[PDB]
């Protein structure tokens, strides 16, 4: 059951996003546009901006529907304002339908575009409950199943060069594949497995053990949850609650302390690089989050490897050497499963029977000794327990 269609329209990078082509208004406008986990309106630049080549401009579509109403959205890093409104929405490389869609037009930011990542735009792809201004914003995916027989459910395959890109490059570059309306199962190797949405809003998970290189880190389980578990590739690391992250990197650094690494490393801040060829990926171990399975005392783990939590990054002196920063970080707002592990995996957002599935990707960056894994079932109790309230 192939897609051809959908496979390899994704461009970008963990640490940029990863963006799909899509059109608005009437003659379409292209705009490139970010796929985003995290977040659930579909916002588009819409007025000039030093770092956007080009913006949707509402007075020349035919098809445009002002909403006479405003929408502020400030982040952590950055913010937005603009204006909403409905127009005709359609993705070139993705199912062939045209749907009549909320719009934001954003006509200030701060923080927001960054100067050479490429997108024009977001594409929040979780649920009303965190639409801004409310919940009465019919987000985009919820708007193309209703009104087309697109089914309720896509997937993402998010591929990591392994190496830095620059903006050339990406340019050029397959990113991905978003399937829109299925699962292309060549995209993965083994085994899906499924955790539940716990509740729709974000896509919430709940994680019932942590290992680094087999050993527990031995946490009560709500501490993984804490305030809760999300997956987003709008988000670029695997961001784990202060209690767990420091736990988490003194494992981390136990494993790996035949090299000493300064502090701003393990902070994510500062690169550390290697000659050519050389990084000692083996003495880096894996590391394995368990999720809640369908069935009743089941789990199931995902292992990622360092080719996945070390992010290729340019080097400061360019020099022909290989670097990487920590792409794991501290949380005050609950786990993260961001971009950098979701290149390990080909991810399943099934809304229709509210569940995530996880399989190896077919795109993982790996060595000829391990690769990513997802492995089940194991005998789990009291995982309801995990969870927060
Ligand atoms: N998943 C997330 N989405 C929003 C919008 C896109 C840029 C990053 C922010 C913060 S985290």
Redesign the pocket.
């Known amino acids: 059951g192939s897609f051809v269609e959908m496979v390899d329209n994704l461009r970008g990078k963990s640490g940029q996003?990863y963006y799909v082509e899509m059109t608005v208004g009437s003659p379409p406008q292209t705009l490139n546009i970010?796929v985003?986990?995290?977040?659930s309106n579909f916002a588009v630049g819409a007025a000039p901006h030093p770092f956007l080549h080009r913006y949707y401009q509402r007075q020349l579509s035919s098809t445009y529907r002002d909403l006479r109403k405003g929408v502020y959205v400030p982040?952590?890093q950055?913010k937005w304002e603009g204006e909403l409104g409905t127009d005709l929405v359609s993705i070139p490389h993705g199912p062939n339908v045209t749907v009549r869609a909320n719009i934001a037009a954003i006509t200030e930011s701060d923080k927001?575009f960054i100067n050479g990542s490429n997108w024009e735009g977001?594409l929040?792809l979780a649920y009303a409950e965190i639409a801004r201004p409310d919940d009465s914003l019919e987000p985009f995916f919820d708007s193309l199943v209703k009104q087309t027989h697109v089914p309720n459910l896509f997937s993402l395959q998010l591929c990591g060069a392994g190496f830095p890109l620059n903006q050339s490059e990406v340019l050029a570059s397959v990113g991905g594949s978003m399937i829109i309306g299925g699962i292309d199962h060549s995209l993965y190797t083994g085994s899906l497995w499924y955790t539940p949405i716990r509740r729709e809003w974000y896509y919430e998970v709940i994680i019932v053990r942590v290992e680094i290189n087999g050993q527990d880190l031995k946490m009560d389980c709500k501490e993984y949850n804490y305030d809760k578990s999300i997956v987003?590739?709008?988000?670029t690391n695997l961001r784990l609650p202060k209690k767990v992250f420091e736990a988490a990197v003194k494992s981390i650094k136990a494993a790996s302390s035949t090299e000493k690494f300064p502090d701003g490393f393990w902070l994510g801040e500062q690169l550390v690089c290697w000659q050519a060829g050389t990084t000692p990926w083996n003495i880096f171990p894996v590391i394995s989050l368990y999720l809640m399975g369908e069935v009743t005392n089941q789990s199931f783990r995902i292992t990622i490897l360092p080719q996945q939590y070390l992010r290729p990054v340019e080097d400061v002196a360019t020099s022909q050497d290989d670097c990487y920063k920590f792409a794991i970080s501290q949380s005050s707002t609950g786990t993260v499963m961001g971009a950098v592990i979701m290149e390990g995996f080909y991810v399943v957002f099934d809304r229709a029977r509210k569940r995530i599935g996880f399989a190896v990707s077919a795109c993982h960056v790996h060595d000829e000794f391990r690769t990513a894994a997802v492995e089940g079932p194991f005998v789990t109790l009291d995982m309801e327990d995990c969870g927060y309230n």
């Open positions: 996003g970010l985003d986990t995290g977040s982040y952590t950055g927001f977001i929040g987003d590739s709008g988000t």
